[PDB]
Design a protein around this ligand. Structure first.
Ligand code: FAD
Length: 498
């Protein structure tokens, strides 16, 4: 059937879009391929933890996997599982593995909650056609408030065993002349204190994050999506994956949508149509839909920029071996609180999350997720044979990112007399993981594949809302930018188009 607006997906771009559409009085249907995560499983919790992964941990895989960095300690808990509609999808391309959330709330279900605005000067560099004053004056503040961003208590941080890991890297970094910053979060830090005090059920303090948090984390189901449903104008259908998009002869849109069960069995195909179509299927999902539509002839006027301009936000993971006298602790909160800010917009820029590790015993390891400035980009290319959009990114394209991360951490190692770990990312000596991505950006870049508000070139009433808009890099953790951009875009779209 027909509905005025359809939003594909339920991550950040989608959630913002649907809230504002509903507040404007536009009846809106959101289509989400994953689950609504609200049923207690066999342990009485909705989500599995990192020390007890089960089928809920994985989107249609036959074995659980350890968190990147943690294989040496967490492979012992891996198990064979039945392919299931779990929460975390490791999407494998030829030389890149991209990790994305699947469910109502998208990546907000599985992410570390870190809520960071980009440096304004870098924003202005990457998106020179966008008015940065309205972003910083209006839309970034609007996003932080509605996302429920909050700040850790510095005294508690300084005192608690749960953040020793962070203080160790802070102290090590300082010897190299490098500074740290507190990173705001959507995890309720007040709740986290009460966890540590034994007052409330633990989540961050019970090795949960990447397969969901049973408590504490204000994911989008709690914030934007709850509010959208509250408008009375928004509904969400789950286990509904959009496969194809076409325009109708009179200029609306028609979708083919597969409904599955949690075992992946096809229950129905349906046709859904609309006047307004908003893509919020993520960098991978939105881009795949549009590349497919262009190359199978259902949206024949899409431009050549659809599929282009993808990057992994410069993501590189690395680890240092601490001196024995600098243990990182057996008890590490699963929510990062500090970053190393070494980002000056030059090619040596690094913003590095000080990442906790879930092992639960002392390992002396400090883990980092570096965000770098690497101009290399990939392209999604439709494969008509398999009906998939393939990302053509090659491992060598991450060399600039590796080089920047290594220069930063080499400073820290020299100042402290420490060395890297070489064994965390497989048998082969490898200090820098260079073939994963938690922060996929691009594929439908703002102003390239779209106009400056995400209107898809070649089409009216067709919008892209999500990380596919971003030109490959933001220099920080991306969801605040995605949210704020979406606020800007949907507001304008509603005013001028709807
Ligand atoms: C392990 C991990 C840690 C991270 N930590 C942080 C952090 O601390 N801070 C930060 O800023 N960012 C972090 N991120 C990144 C952040 O989560 C993403 O940048 C953000 O979620 C992207 O939002 P989006 O709206 O583009 O898409 P997503 O949040 O990915 O949402 C897309 C949604 O669309 C659905 N979908 C896809 N295709 C279809 C289709 N065809 N039909 C129907 N539904 C579809 C998906 O299932 C999903 O629910 C992390 C991500 C991961 C995986």
């Amino acid at each position: 059937g027909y509905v005025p607006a359809v939003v594909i997906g339920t991550g950040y771009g989608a959630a913002v879009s649907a809230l504002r559409l509903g507040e404007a009085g536009v009846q809106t249907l959101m289509l989400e391929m994953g689950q609504l995560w609200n049923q207690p499983g066999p342990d009485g919790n909705i989500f599995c933890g990192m020390l007890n992964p089960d089928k809920r941990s994985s989107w249609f895989k036959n074995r659980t996997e350890a968190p990147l960095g943690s294989f040496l300690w967490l492979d012992v808990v891996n198990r064979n599982i039945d392919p299931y509609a779990g929460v975390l999808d490791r999407v494998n391309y030829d030389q890149m593995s991209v990790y994305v959330g699947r469910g109502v709330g998208g990546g907000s279900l599985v992410n570390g909650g870190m809520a960071v605005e980009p440096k304004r000067s870098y924003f202005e560099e990457i998106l020179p056609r966008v008015d940065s004053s309205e972003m910083y004056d209006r839309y970034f503040p609007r996003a932080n408030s509605m996302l429920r961003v909050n700040h850790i208590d510095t005294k508690w941080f300084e005192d608690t065993e749960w953040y020793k890991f962070a203080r160790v890297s802070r102290e090590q970094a300082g010897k190299a002349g490098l500074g740290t910053v507190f990173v705001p979060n959507v995890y309720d830090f007040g709740y986290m204190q009460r966890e540590a005090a034994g007052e409330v059920p633990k989540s961050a303090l019970a090795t949960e994050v990447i397969y969901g948090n049973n408590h504490g984390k204000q994911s989008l189901d709690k914030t934007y999506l709850a509010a959208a449903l509250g408008t009375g104008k928004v509904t969400i259908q789950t286990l509904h994956q959009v496969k194809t998009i076409r325009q109708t002869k009179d200029g609306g849109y028609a979708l083919t949508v597969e409904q599955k069960d949690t075992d992946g069995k096809l229950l129905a195909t349906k046709e859904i149509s609309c006047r307004y179509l908003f893509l919020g299927a993520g960098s991978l999902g939105s881009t795949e839909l549009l590349v497919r539509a262009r190359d199978t002839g259902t949206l024949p006027n899409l431009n050549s920029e659809v599929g282009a301009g993808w990057g992994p936000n410069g993501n590189i993971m690395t680890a240092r071996a601490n001196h024995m006298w600098n243990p990182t602790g057996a008890h590490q909160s699963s929510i990062p609180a500090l970053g190393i800010d070494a980002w000056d917009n030059s090619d040596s820029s690094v913003f590095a999350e000080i990442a906790p590790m879930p092992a639960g015993l002392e390992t002396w390891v400090s883990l980092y997720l570096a965000i770098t400035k690497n101009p290399q980009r990939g392209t999604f290319v439709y494969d008509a044979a398999t009906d998939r959009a393939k990302l053509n990114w090659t491992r060598d394209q991450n060399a600039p990112a590796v080089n920047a991360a290594k220069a930063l951490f080499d400073r820290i190692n020299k100042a402290n007399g420490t060395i890297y770990r070489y064994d965390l990312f497989g048998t082969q000596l490898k200090a820098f993981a260079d073939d994963f991505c938690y922060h996929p950006l691009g594929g439908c870049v703002l102003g390239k594949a779209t106009d400056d508000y995400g209107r898809v070139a070649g089409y009216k009433n067709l919008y892209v809302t999500d990380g596919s808009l971003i030109p490959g890099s933001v220099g920080v953790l991306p969801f605040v930018t995605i949210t704020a951009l979406a606020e800007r875009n949907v507001e304008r779209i509603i005013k001028q188009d709807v």
